[model samples]
Target: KKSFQTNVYRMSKFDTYIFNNLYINDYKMFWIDSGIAKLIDKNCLVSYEINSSSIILLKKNSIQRFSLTSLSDENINVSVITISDSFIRSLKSYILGNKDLLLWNCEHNDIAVLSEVVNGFREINYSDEFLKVFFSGFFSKVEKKYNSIFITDDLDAMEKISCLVKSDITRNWRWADICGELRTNRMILKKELESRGVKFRELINSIRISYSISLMKTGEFKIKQIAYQSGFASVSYFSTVFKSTMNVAPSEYLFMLTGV
Candidate 1:
């Protein structure tokens, strides 16, 4: 069951931001963003729904999703990655899968330490540049292997790790194209691009949305050229996907976002 309700929005695709749960009271509840969430109350259930513009949250024991729409007034536009039930069940198992990979890949001396860090989310601090790279390397490795384990019993674990990897990658979403190519070639991956149905292509559209937003901001390139760069081969196809995903024509969104 869920104890909180929340809402989140993404303004310009791949606009990554952090959300901290500073406070929540009896009548006030917000599903926190990021990090692991374990159900402390069995009777308490949390529900989440992700749409193009916002994430809807409601407590399982309660009704009516509280419209926590204050972020817009604060200029903090970001997408919300929700865990739900499947997410909580699979986090530990995904960690185990990552541990197995470390056993085969990392130096013997560091493997144990890496294992501990992966499980506990604890690590010694470092300088700014080094820390960024450190997190990036960890994310790269985890994203590649999150879907490796084929064990059906670990469905919750799979869902959890999927959310984690998605959160990590979406934060650094410029790498979406890179991730797509990586999953295609090696390391026993899943969700192949050729296999992308509606769900997967929507993520691709999210990535394309970010890239297109940049080009639109620049105000130099033709819309057709922007479409190509966003991985759409044809202008008509790009327009169709854009309108479907974003509810606005490319030209319309460009003008709405940035005026002449």
Candidate 2:
């Protein structure tokens, strides 16, 4: 097969019992054009695709994040839409190299653009015009969505601040410190967060609690140390906040997890 060849399996008639080995180089897409189906993207598979995400809800006639042999075991109809190995290289470069589109993960896709991709796959079972016309159109759709949803707003401001805090979970963070780092005053910072309906304290505590949970799962440190390590400064305060957020004491949450 030439590199950009598209494999369009019309799952209404044929079942592509695709195993994960087929995905060593190729990327997969599923168009739920007809019936309903459940899709699985394993932990490592998702991390490789995008940073943090949950199970994708598969609605009819929509694209979603599914991967490998992890498609629904039940006899549900859907299409496994993709192309050859080298195509993936060009596909990623074609998208990432030009624009800041995370189009690989298969969300916010334009239906007509992707439907055009499916229709093109049927005639030749190859990638020729598929590369020139459809790829360009598909990528443009992703870019439009990306521009409207993300670049239009200050939504990423929080993403930037979250990364800063998570980078040093143990460090004592103050409002002035964050304001200084973001090059903004305390009042503007508060507004930016509140605009997204997130309080500053809630954001910090949520990040800390999340970090402490990961550390707690390792079963490495005591609660007091975890408190300090997560910037809590006191064990009693840590336990109080942990229970309030997680609805269980730190020790009890740990016990519930490993049953140790």
Candidate 3:
């Protein structure tokens, strides 16, 4: 069973922020933008409505209940079971299948941690082949779908990092290098990104990995060539990280997509 205390702070008359226990060094806000918040409030079946233009905070027990019909199989019910410091819990109906799928929380400090949990739960009953296909589309959708509550303090650093990552795809930049380029302190950059549920290195890897995937889909380059183009130092390191992130090897992923 999951156990944790929830502290809900009202950010405005309509906005609230939820936390687990007291704030930590990595505490960050999960902000649902007003337009989307309104949509959720309107369509959500929960008794309470999320205020438009406000932040709603949640921890373990704070949520009375959350239930959704599965996107893959609507007959399969998806329901929240528990929440704790490490994970947010949910269970799918056994009617779908009894073969259990294992999932782990990604080591990041962001609202999308919750998103990962949800996506993982969605795949509980999937077959291995289906899993591969599901994830391929799922991750691409996730990349386009941006959700986060941006507190005022970290905005400057967040924007700086964004520009740094986009400004040059190739520089083999370090966290400190980008910090220097942005004229921000390294520690401050680290703390700011962490609070937003990302680390300095994780952000860099994500950009590189995403870029590499785009290149791979084009069918123009060998794995080794793509690795260097994506800013990885070696093909072996690139393959390792690629499998971990994409859950498939570069060549295997290519085969899966193109059947080559």
Candidate 4:
């Protein structure tokens, strides 16, 4: 059997699942033509090919991320097939090479769990059970990585400032309002973000503009709706900022993404 590959990065778990259903299931090869993948994460390099209906997730040495669904989705019964053992060995070596970096990026609990799972892989015969074991470790690391960023202990003024700006883009995101919401002095908030290499107004605008881009891709909202929702007081100004940041006009970007 032959298959194609694409590497999507920074995808929320939900977004990944949506793409799996939309492109892999509904429109086979449509993502390669539609340009949706390009907009998802511009930093990752990926290639597209037609015909492979499977998604293989590689973590360290084994593949557990392949479709257990193809059996259900296509109603084809198949048995296990073995590929070159040396190929699997090389993949395992490459994944293990990055082990130190992975642990440093993960929480202590995640590190312990992943190490245990990888060790388990070594002790047992390779089989379907390996997928369940590997994914359990895989998602644990993902959860911890994001959790560290999204979930924090009692947010200090600096963190609170970010939260306020992010959650309510439509507000008058001024220093006074921000400090007032946090029950702190304007000077204190300004100093906090400045110390972190950010400015008050720049951060607010950054959050709004970033969110606006996400909304634009949904194809459900009009440009005007995105502008307003993104907290731009005017659609014209939103376009100006969008061009300044993304280097393309919003209309052009929308056309590129939705191809409408």
Give per-model TM-scores: 0.31, 0.42, 0.40, 0.42
- Which candidate number has the best lDDT? 2
Q: Which of candidates 2 and 4 is the stronger one according to lDDT?
A: 2
Q: Which pairs of residues collide in candidate 1?
A: 1-44, 1-45, 1-46, 2-45, 2-46, 90-156, 90-157
| Per-residue alpha-carbon lDDT of candidate 1 for residues 101-198, written as tens digits (9 for 90 to 100) | 11023433333333323233246533434423443343345446554431224333223333333334334333344447344332333342223222
Count clashing pairs, candidate 1.
Answer: 7
- Candidate 4 residue-wise lDDT, 121-200, digit = tens: 35544444454444334434443544232112335455466567667778887888886888888766667655433455
Cα RMSD to the true fold for all candidates = 16.2, 14.1, 19.2, 15.8
lDDT of each structure? Answer: 0.37, 0.48, 0.41, 0.41
- For model 2, how does the per-residue alpha-carbon lDDT over 145-201 read when each residue is reduced to its tens digit? 443321112234554566678788777777877877878677656764554334567
Question: What is the lDDT for 230 in model 3?
Answer: 83
Model 4 TM-score, 2 decimals: 0.42
Cα lDDT for residue 186, candidate 2: 76
- Candidate 1 vs candidate 4: the lDDT winner is 4
TM-score of 2: 0.42
